[PDB]
C-alpha cells in the first residue's frame, strides 16, 4: 500500500509528506563574490 493510486486524476492523490530538500544559500549568501569565514570579509 501507500503507493497505489485508485483514481486516474493526479489531483486525486495523497500529499507528499515525506520529502526533505533544502537550499538556504539563496537567502543567507546572496553575494556575488565568495566570502571565506576564516579570511577577513573586507
Amino acid at each position: 500500500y501507500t503507493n497505489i493510486n485508485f483514481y486516474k486524476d493526479a489531483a486525486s492523490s495523497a500529499s507528499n509528506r515525506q520529502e526533505l530538500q533544502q537550499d538556504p544559500g539563496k537567502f543567507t549568501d546572496p553575494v556575488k563574490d565568495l566570502m571565506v569565514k576564516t579570511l577577513p570579509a573586507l
Binding site: 544559500g25 553575494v31 556575488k32 563574490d33 566570502m35
Partner: protein, 250 residues
C-alpha cells in the same frame, strides 16, 4: 576588494569604497526562452538605447528624516527611450540594477537600510476608504515616511509598520544592503524579474518598491558640512517588449 567598476551602455559608475554586490535570490537576469513564452510575435530588443544608467533626483538626509520610497518601473518613465517604448508597447520585460550613493567624512555617523520589496502593498490611513493613485506614485520626487500616525485619504507612512502592516526590523528577509558611513558609501543591488505572469503591463503594475530607512540617526558637531545628499541611480537590463500600437497618453 573595495574598488569596483560597472559599465553598461554609454555610462560607467566607479566606486572606491563598497561591498560585494548582492544578486537578487542568486539568479542573474536573462531573456525569456521559447518554452516559457506565451506570446506569438517578434519581440523588439533594444540593447544600448534602453539599457543604461538613469540618475534620479537627489534628496537631503537631515537628522530628523524618517525615510523615502520609490515605486518603479513607473518612476523610470519619460526618461530616455525606455519610457518612450513603454508608451507604444502593451507588454514588457526588464531587469534592474540599483546603485545608491551617500558620502560623508570620518567625523559623521549614521546608518541606512536599502531594501527592495517585491509586490509591496500600501494600506490607507482611513481603513474605510481608498486613496488616489497620486499618493503612491508621483514620478518626480520621493515620498516621505513619518514618525507618527497620520489621517486622511493617504497611506499610513508610519516607520513602525512601514505602510505594509509588518515589523520594520523584519524587512531584512528581502535582498538588502546597509550603508554605514564609517565603512562604506555606496550600495549596489541587482534584481531579476519576478512576476506570476511572464509579461505584464508596466503602467498599471508596480513590480517592486525601493525603501531607504535610517535606523541610526545622522549626528555631527559644529563646523562639519550639514548638507549630505543621497542619490539613486538605476539601469534597466535585458529590456524586451511585445505588442505595438498607438502611444498611450499617461
Amino acid at each position: 576588494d573595495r574598488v569596483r567598476s560597472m559599465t553598461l551602455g554609454n555610462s560607467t559608475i566607479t566606486t572606491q569604497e563598497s561591498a560585494n554586490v548582492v544578486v537578487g535570490y542568486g539568479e542573474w537576469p536573462s531573456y525569456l526562452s521559447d518554452k516559457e513564452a506565451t506570446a506569438e510575435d517578434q519581440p523588439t530588443q533594444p540593447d544600448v538605447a534602453t539599457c543604461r544608467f538613469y540618475t534620479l533626483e537627489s534628496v537631503q538626509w537631515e537628522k530628523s528624516s524618517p525615510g523615502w520610497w520609490w515605486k518603479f518601473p513607473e518612476a523610470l518613465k519619460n526618461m530616455g527611450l525606455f519610457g518612450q517604448n513603454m508608451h507604444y508597447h502593451y507588454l514588457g520585460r526588464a531587469g534592474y540594477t540599483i546603485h545608491v550613493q551617500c558620502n560623508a567624512s570620518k567625523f559623521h555617523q549614521g546608518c541606512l537600510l536599502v531594501v527592495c520589496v517585491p509586490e509591496a502593498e500600501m494600506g490607507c490611513a482611513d481603513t474605510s476608504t481608498t486613496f488616489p493613485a497620486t499618493e503612491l506614485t508621483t514620478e518626480e520626487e520621493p515620498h516621505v515616511f513619518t514618525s507618527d500616525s497620520i489621517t486622511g485619504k493617504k497611506v499610513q507612512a508610519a516607520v513602525c509598520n512601514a505602510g505594509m502592516g509588518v515589523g520594520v526590523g523584519n524587512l531584512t528577509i528581502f535582498p538588502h544592503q546597509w550603508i554605514n558611513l564609517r565603512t562604506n558609501n555606496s550600495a549596489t543591488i541587482v534584481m531579476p524579474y519576478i512576476n506570476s505572469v511572464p509579461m505584464d503591463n508596466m503602467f498599471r503594475h508596480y513590480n517592486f518598491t525601493l525603501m531607504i530607512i535610517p535606523f541610526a540617526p545622522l549626528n555631527f558637531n559644529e563646523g562639519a558640512t550639514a548638507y549630505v545628499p543621497v542619490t539613486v541611480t538605476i539601469a534597466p537590463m535585458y529590456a524586451e517588449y511585445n505588442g505595438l500600437r498607438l502611444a498611450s497618453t499617461q
